[PDB]
Structures are given as structure tokens and as C-alpha cells.
Amino acid sequence: VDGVVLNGPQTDVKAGEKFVEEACRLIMEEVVLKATDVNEKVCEWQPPEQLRQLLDLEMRDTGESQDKLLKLCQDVIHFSVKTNHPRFFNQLYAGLDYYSLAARIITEALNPSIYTYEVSPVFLLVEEAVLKKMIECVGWKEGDGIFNPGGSVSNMCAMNLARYRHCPDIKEKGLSGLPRLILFTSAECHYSMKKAASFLGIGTQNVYFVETDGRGKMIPEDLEKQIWQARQEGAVPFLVCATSGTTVLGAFDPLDEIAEVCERHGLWLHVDASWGGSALVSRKHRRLLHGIHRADSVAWNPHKMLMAGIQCSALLVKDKSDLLKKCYSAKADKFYDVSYDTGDKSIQCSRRPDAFKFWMTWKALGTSGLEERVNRAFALSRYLVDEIKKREGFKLLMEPEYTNVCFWYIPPSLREMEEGPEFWRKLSLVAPAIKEKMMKKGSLMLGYQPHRGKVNFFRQVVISPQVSREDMDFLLDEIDSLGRDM
Amino acid sequence: VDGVVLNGPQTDVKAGEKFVEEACRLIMEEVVLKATDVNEKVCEWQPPEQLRQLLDLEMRDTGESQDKLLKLCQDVIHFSVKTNHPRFFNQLYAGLDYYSLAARIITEALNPSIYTYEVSPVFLLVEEAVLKKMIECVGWKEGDGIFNPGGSVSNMCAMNLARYRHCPDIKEKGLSGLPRLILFTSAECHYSMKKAASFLGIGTQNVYFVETDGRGKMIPEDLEKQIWQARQEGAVPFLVCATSGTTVLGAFDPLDEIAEVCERHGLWLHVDASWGGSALVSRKHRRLLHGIHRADSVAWNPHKMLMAGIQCSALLVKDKSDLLKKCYSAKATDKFYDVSYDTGDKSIQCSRRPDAFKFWMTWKALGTSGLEERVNRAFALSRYLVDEIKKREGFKLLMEPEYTNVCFWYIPPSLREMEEGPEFWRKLSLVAPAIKEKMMKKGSLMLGYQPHRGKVNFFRQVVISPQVSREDMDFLLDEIDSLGRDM
Ligand SMILES: *Cc1c(COP(=O)(O)O)cnc(C)c1O
Ligand SMILES: *Cc1c(COP(=O)(O)O)cnc(C)c1O
């Protein structure tokens, strides 16, 4: 010693290291080992103003003792939704993949960023591997891609690419003097298509929506109409965005008949497979994405159907001439193959190795194990279907094309009624009220939402391979019980 | 009963439960407990084609037994860079905060998304807490914000906000019929300002750069000049982006004199404090961002100076009328709780992680006082290395640092008796890349070297981790000197 302004190490490491070991056990005791126990509440509901009185969130000038901090962690787990609980069907993700989680913890400790090979050599070789594999599942011989934070941004990137490819001078000039650029998507499209059009300075008014048929599928005959009208307005079409697996219904646009339309006019074709993309793993169901190999770009989120954990979404491009680079290049030599850097393919600088956790799963299960996981979801989906039809008071909107089982629950008081406006206006308030109860019970969680002209209906999503047939029987047994007297 | 179309389960949990327990212990033994040990290699260098031949990355139809898988994890750590090693100064982050890691692991197991209160009640109350606290450090009375994946997106989001405020019809009509929108930033700005300008359909040609003085600081007299020229071209200025802590030099634009220029013309003022933002925690050094409370929006990444872990970047807005919402809304789908506590329509993202929770865990564990002291020690260690660099010969300092960005050349002995002419620089250029090549093969150090705005290859040092000691600074210069003495 010493110096100014006072030097040493000043740290209480060996204690702070225990807090990490103690947190690890909380994960094991209170999450990992209780992950498959159906006998636990999916959520400990407490309104906002009551949960504030339970957590002590104020960050004061002084710290808190290790006991008080371990209490917070004890509570943070107790009061949060259990996304791993087998009875969690509230989102397009659920369950706990043990192998992806172990990889997830690793990434957290190393705390790597994927600027370049010199900081993340392993994880950059893994992203190369995963992207190459995914590109095979699509059917391309070569390609290119990056991992974005959420398939929402993946679509944004693909929209920005289709604009750069159409007129790469937009990167420098901007859109001031350019005519109206127009993209075409289905009205069943994710809403990130809307945020994107605005964000990229294209405007939501320039997102032409193509009519869908009775199954939620885009109609390629109409698309030709919308592309000629756009031109005849003086506007410049440049992109078509189909969806292979919508969020609500799980529909699958016909990519082979859309590709034939995009190729007649030379328009980028982007397929939003954030949800249905994982079906490409199954030889049995990968036909849902027939013709995807004719698109120019594909979005795919493994954190959904394959339980990679949040976040994990990839954008794949059919190019190999560094178009990704040519589009996202900016400022910044020796001494290694600089090709293995990717800092200038993305809009972000820092980035986490989202693709590594998936790699850990694919190694642990192989394509064969992932194939079975996707296929089983379809079985459990179609099982719930067969059981829903047996019951009265459960109306199915349609046979699902994916694992999105959309149905109403009609209480007995509303049966023998007539299919008129007055009937719907009352059926509307059923799902939201059945959701209020199952959230206070902590025994179930399903999504309710309107769609198109349809009023509040349920959407069920089978993903986790811990779900059992008995978890589907309980779904209908539970909803029935909570809405029997409504 | 058992029946069609193939039912069970048949998952073999108890194995998957070991792999998690075994990985947890692997983390403890080989990372957490070895975090501060300086005598270990900062990195196990192996080129791609040799590291590819060592990891076996191929994803086959079949899986691999847990023993090979536990080997994989063992190798991934052995060959990866140790960002927690105290002698890691290669980027604007480093070190291991044990408390943020515990929070990182917690978030990791729950695997939550922050759509709404019904999915992430806790983490939404935590994000409200952090945002409110941060907004005080800025000096605002009230505000609004969200956590983005990386300060790059924070700048992108703030730039899109200023455009919505300037003409909110751009959200629907777009930019087709509108005149040229122009923003003004410093040439010392992060490059996400260029990526953003392109991405948002504004165009890089419309990013006017204001000249910098000898300290790297924007010159408010020029800023006024560029706004009159821009307008006199028929173009429409709408945003000014100052930087409170540049990446290379660590400069701090003068926010009070820039704000006065933005207020005379009614232009959004955005401060890129992704790096220097953490200085607001220090009463001594928070003067570097004097006048930030006059800006309309602030970006601030705790995953850097405060060691929150990646990723963690916040966008703060001076509004309270749900401008963030009004701008990033797509009301795509009501009782029975206060929907105000949802944030799904404030972001450009749909799904989102609780980046702010790990920081909250640190602030709780250390208090504002602990965060203040950690920031100050970095400043001291910076000024120590500075004073030590001047004592040594062969080390030329580009300038006195305003932050913890210590930029210096290393002049091998062969070039110390030369003259300060062109040929001198041209040879000095290849010094840093070759001194970096060795320390990466030695595995004993990692700091960044880069050219800059006409300066030739020089080193950049970033003091962050409070595990760094004077002995880690003396070794920095002793090591660089040793590796380049024979050049
Ligand atoms: C889930 C989804 C997205 C994007 O989801 P993120 O979690 O934001 O990545 C986009 N489109 C569809 C059809 C989706 O299901
Ligand atoms: C570190 C830094 C950033 C970081 O952006 P990321 O996308 O989070 O990596 C942006 N701007 C400046 C000035 C920075 O120092």
C-alpha cells in the first residue's frame, strides 16, 4: 500500500461468491426440480399495488444484507409466473429444456458479446454451425444469417434488406425523393410487420393486406391484384411477407404458389416462420412450409416451439455475396480471417450468443429428438381436438393446421340460445372472466383474444413435451368448472 | 392407458436435472471462483480452423451422452475469452458482479417475457423502479422509458421518437412525400447513429457532423451553423444527438450549451450516455453530464461501467403523456387489472427480457453509495495509469482523459530516435496490431487498439472492474513494453 484516492482491492469476494452458489440452489430447489410438478400453482396472483408491499423495490443509498437479498430472490421466484409449469399455455413458448438452460447459465457467467471472433471465438463458430443447419432444414444449398433479439426484429431486418436490395442507394439518400415503397402481407400477420413499416420510414398506410381464405391462408390470386393496383397507383412494390404459422390460428400461407407470384414481378419474398419454422425439423409436418426453399429470406424463433429459452430468433438469407454486410456495414486489419466477424451484419453492436443454447439442445437430442418433440405436440394438439368435439359447450373455430387450438367455451346459460348479435355480445365476456379465475387459482393459464370479426375465444398452444394427455383433460375439466355457472 | 399417436411421457427428467446441477457446479469451480485469479490465461487462442477441429460442432440426427456433453461445456469455457478476468480491457465492459450474475441466473431459469403484468408481474415492477431511479440521476422530475437490447437500439428508438414528435403522421404515411429530415451529431459519435439513419429510411447523407475541438467535444458554435445551412438547403432539422462519453476517447459534449441551441430552434435533444451515463452515480464526476436534465431523451447502458452483464441498455424520455406508447403502438390483440402496468406497446420489440432486473439486484446489494464508490475507483485507476504512463518512456499519451478511456501509443525503441514525420507514423501503425497479436497468443492481456478520425493505430484502455489493482496497471505497461521492446 498505498495511493490516492486510496487503493487496495476493497472487495468481499468470498462472500459475494456464496450468493452465486446460494442462488444456484434456489434455481434447483425452487425451479428446476419443481418444474414438472403439476401440483404447483402456475402463478401466485397479486395485483400491482399489493405486490409492491411484498417485494421492497426501493433502491436506497445503502445496500442490504445477504439474508435480505436472498429473501428478495426467494420472493422473486415465488411471485413470478411459472413458464416452465406444464399447465402454462398462455404464450407461444413454455416448458423448461434442461440442456438449453445449462447452456443459458454458462453464457450468463462468461458474459460474452458477439462483436468479433477475438471476443467470442466459440460462440461465433456455433452460430455458424446452427445457421448452416437451419439453412439445410429450409432446403437451400447456401445462405447467410444472424441471430436477432426477437423474430419481430428479424422481420424488420428482412424488410430493410429487401429495400436495400431494391435500391441500395436508400442507405445513403434515404426515402425523401423516392416513390412509395409498398410491401404486401396477410391480415393474419404478426403486428411486428406494422411496427416495422413505421420504424423503417415506410409507413403503415403502405402495408397492403391481402385477403385470406377460410383457413387463414393468403390468397395468391388476390396478391396479383394488389401488385398491379400498387403499380397503377404509381407506387413501387418491393416485398411480400408470408407467414408460415400465424400467432392466433397458426395458419400456413402457400409458399410455392406465392413464390410463383413473387418471381413473375421480381419481388423479395420473406417468410415469417417465427412460429411454424420449427416444423421444418419434422419430416412428417415440414410440408406445412412447402416451397419455403423458393423464398429469399426466412425468420425462425427456436425459443418458441423448441424451448431454446428467451431470446432466440434467426434471420436467414438466400445470399452468399455478403449482402447482409453490404446492407449493415459501418465504421470501425490484422491478424486473422476477419471473415469470422459479424459485427457489421446486424443493427446492434453488442449481442448475446442466443444461438448457443439452441446448439446445446440440438446436440443433446439430435434432429431425431427434436423431430419427436414437434410431432408429439401435434398429437397432443389433435388429442385435445378429439376431446373438445366430444364435449358440449366447447365450439371449435376450425381444425387447427398447427398446434393453435382455438375454441369458445359456451356456458350452459347461453346454450339453446340463437346465433344472433345478442348471443355473441354475451359470449364475449366469458373467456375474460374464465381467465380471471384461473389466474387467481393459479391452476391454469390460457390466452383469450378477439381476431378478425370473431369475438373473445380461447387459444391453446401445446409445446412442452412434459404436457400429458391428462393435462389436456384437466384443461377442459378446469375451464368447464369455472364457466359452468356463467 | 397408453394410446396413439405415440404417448407417454418418456422424457428422463432426472438426467436433465443432473446436467443443470452439473453445469451449475462447473460454473462455480471454473468461472465464479477463478474470476479474480490473475495468473490464469485471459484467453486460449486457437484460430477458427484449429478451434473448429477441437469442439466438434456438428449437429447430428442422434444426440450425445451427458459425459460428452459435459465435456463440450468444459471445452466451451476453456477456449472462450474470460471477460471477468481483471486483466481484460478489450471492450467497454469487463469483470464479474456476483449479485447481477445471481439475478442473471434467476431470470435465466424463470425464462420470462415482459409482454405485460399478467406474464411478468415482478420484473415489470422492477423495471418501473429502475427507470424511475435512473430518471432521478438524470435530473428530471418525471419520465418514461423502456429497456432495449443494446444502446444501439436505444439510439434508434430515440431517433424514431424525435421523428414521431416532429411529424407523427410519418408512422402512417411514411417519408415518401416529406422533405429531408436531418439530425446533427459529433464525429466522435457511435456508429449506430449511421446504421440508425439508414435503417429508419432517413439516409446517412442526412447525418450532419459537427466539428469537434481539441478535447473531442462538439462545438456549439458550429451546431448553430449546420442548422441554418440545413434549413437554407430546404431541409428540415429535427434531432440533435450529443454523446456523453464517446467510445474511443471518452469525451463529453457540452450539454448545457448544446441544449441552449436545441431550445432556440425546437429540436429534440438526445444524449448517447451509453458509456458515460454511469458517471451520474458519482457526485464527483456527474458534472461531466451537466445539463443532461435539459435534454428530451437519454440512453444509458449499465452493462458497461456498472457491470450489469450483457445486455442492459435503457432509454429514458422526458415525457409523461405516453409518447413512447403513442409512437410504438400497434394495438394488436380489457380488464381486470390496471393495464397501465403493461409495456408491450412502448417498444419496437414484441417479446422482451428483464434486462433491468440484474441491475436492480446490484443496486439493492450495493446501494447508491456502493455504485458511486465503484465508479470513482475506476477514475482513480485511470488517473493512476495516466500518471504512470507519463513516468515511462516509449508511451505517448494522446491527451488527458476526460473519462476512463486512456489512449496512448507505444513507440518501440527503434523509433524513439526518429523524427515526427509521415514515415514515423506509418511504422508506428503496425506496432499495436503486432503487440496485440502476441498478448493474445500469450493469453496474459487484452486491450483494444484502433485508428481514429485520422490518428493512426493506438491503444485504448478502459477501467471498469473494481477487481483491477495497481499491480494490474503496472503489469499493463510492463507487459506492453516487454512485448514490443524488440520491434
Ligand atoms: C412470435 C412471432 C413473431 C415474433 O415474436 P418475438 O418473440 O418478438 O420474436 C413474429 N411473427 C409471428 C407469426 C410470431 O408467432
Ligand atoms: C458502448 C456504446 C454503445 C453500445 O451499443 P450496443 O448496441 O449496446 O453495443 C453505443 N454508443 C456508445 C457511444 C457506446 O459507448
Domain spans of chain A, in order of start = 1-111+354-486, 112-353
Query: What experiment produced this structure?
Result: X-ray
Residue A69's closest CA among A31, A101, A26, A35? A26
What is the distance between the alpha carbons of residues B339 and B322, in angstroms, rounded to a whole number?
13
**H or E element in which residue A377 lies:** helix A354-390
Residue A445's closest CA among A42, A32, A19? A42
What is the distance between the alpha carbons of residues A177 and A350, in angstroms, rounded to a whole number?
33
HEC string of chain B? CCCCCCCCCCCCHHHHHHHHHHHHHHHHHHHHCCCCCCCCCCCCCCCHHHHHHHHCCCCCCCCCCHHHHHHHHHHHHHHCCCCCCCCEECCCCCCCCHHHHHHHHHHHHHCCCCCCCCCCHHHHHHHHHHHHHHHHHHCCCCCEEEEECCHHHHHHHHHHHHHHHHCCCHHHHCCCCCCCEEEEEECCCCCHHHHHHHHCCCCHHHEEEECECCCCCECHHHHHHHHHHHHHCCCEEEEEEEEECCCCCCCECCHHHHHHHHHHHCCEEEEECCCHHHHHHCCCCHHHHCCHHHCCEEEECHHHHCCCCCCCEEEEECCCCCHHHHHHCCCCCCCCCCHHHCCCCCCCCCCCCCHHHHHHHHHHHHHHHHHHHHHHHHHHHHHHHHHHHHHCCCEEECCCCCCCEEEEEECCHHHCCCCCCHHHHHHHCCHHHHHHHHHHHHCCCEEEEEEEECEEEEEEEECCCCCCCHHHHHHHHHHHHHHHCCC
- In angstroms, what is the span from residue B154 Cα to ligand 2's centroid? 9
Top CATH class of B1-111+355-487 equals alpha beta
Residue A314, helix vs strand vs coil: strand
Residue B341's closest CA among B487, B156, B125? B125
Tell me how far CA of residue B374 lies from CA of B220, B355, B380, in angstroms: 32, 21, 10
What is the distance between the alpha carbons of residues B205 and B189, in angstroms, rounded to a whole number?
15
Show the cell assigned to A397.
Answer: 373455430
Looking at residue A415, what DSSP letter applies? Answer: T
Resolution in A: 3.0
What is the distance between the alpha carbons of residues A37 and B432, in angstroms, rounded to a whole number?
57
Residue A5, helix vs strand vs coil: coil
Tell me how far CA of residue B40 lies from CA of A108, B43, B81, B97, in angstroms: 20, 9, 12, 19
**H or E element in which residue A164 lies:** helix A151-166
Minimum distance, in Å, between the CA of residue B233 and any CA atom of chain A: 14
**H or E element in which residue A137 lies:** helix A121-138
**Quick one: residue A44, left, alpha or beta (phi over 0 = left, psi -120 to 50 = alpha)?**
beta
- In angstroms, what is the span from residue A275 Cα to ligand 1's centroid? 7
What is the distance between the alpha carbons of residues B344 and A247, in angstroms, rounded to a whole number?
16
Minimum distance, in Å, between the CA of residue B374 and any CA atom of chain A: 10
CATH topology of domain A1-111+354-486: Aspartate Aminotransferase, domain 1 (3.90.1150)
What is the distance between the alpha carbons of residues A314 and A298, in angstroms, rounded to a whole number?
8
What is the distance between the alpha carbons of residues A397 and A458, in angstroms, rounded to a whole number?
10
Q: Using alpha carbons only, how large is chain B's radius of gyration in Å?
A: 25
- Is residue A89 within 8 Å of A446, Cβ to Cβ? yes
Looking at residue A425, what DSSP letter applies? Answer: H
Mutate to test the interface with B, among A24, A116, A325 (most CBs of B within 10 A): A24
Query: According to CATH, what is the number of the domain A112-353?
Result: 3.40.640.10
Q: Is-same-fold flag (A1-111+354-486; A112-353)?
A: no
Nearest ligand, CA of residue A249?
1
What is the distance between the alpha carbons of residues A449 and A451, in angstroms, rounded to a whole number?
7
Architecture of domain B112-354: 3-Layer(aba) Sandwich (3.40)
Interface residue A330 vs chain B (CB under 8 A): yes
Cβ contacts of A435-440, under 8 Å, gap ≥ 24: A436/B335, A436/B336, A437/A482, A438/A478, A438/A479, A438/A482, A439/A43, A439/A45, A439/B118, A440/A45
Half-sphere exposure of residue A147: CA atoms within 13 angstroms, side-chain side: 31
Pairs of CB atoms within 8 A across A/B? 487
Q: Is A252 in the pocket of ligand 1 (CB under 6 A)?
A: no
Looking at residue A446, what DSSP letter applies? Answer: B
**H or E element in which residue A365 lies:** helix A354-390
What is the distance between the alpha carbons of residues B56 and B300, in angstroms, rounded to a whole number?
39
What is the distance between the alpha carbons of residues B222 and A10, in angstroms, rounded to a whole number?
46
Counts for chain A of helices (H) and strands (E), in that order: 16, 11
What is the distance between the alpha carbons of residues A398 and A401, in angstroms, rounded to a whole number?
9
- A window 95-134, beta carbon within 8 A of B: 96-99, 101-106, 108-113, 115, 117-123, 125-126, 129-130, 133
- Is residue A293 within 8 Å of A315, Cβ to Cβ? no
Burial class (CB in 10 A: 0-12, 13-18, 19+), A373: buried
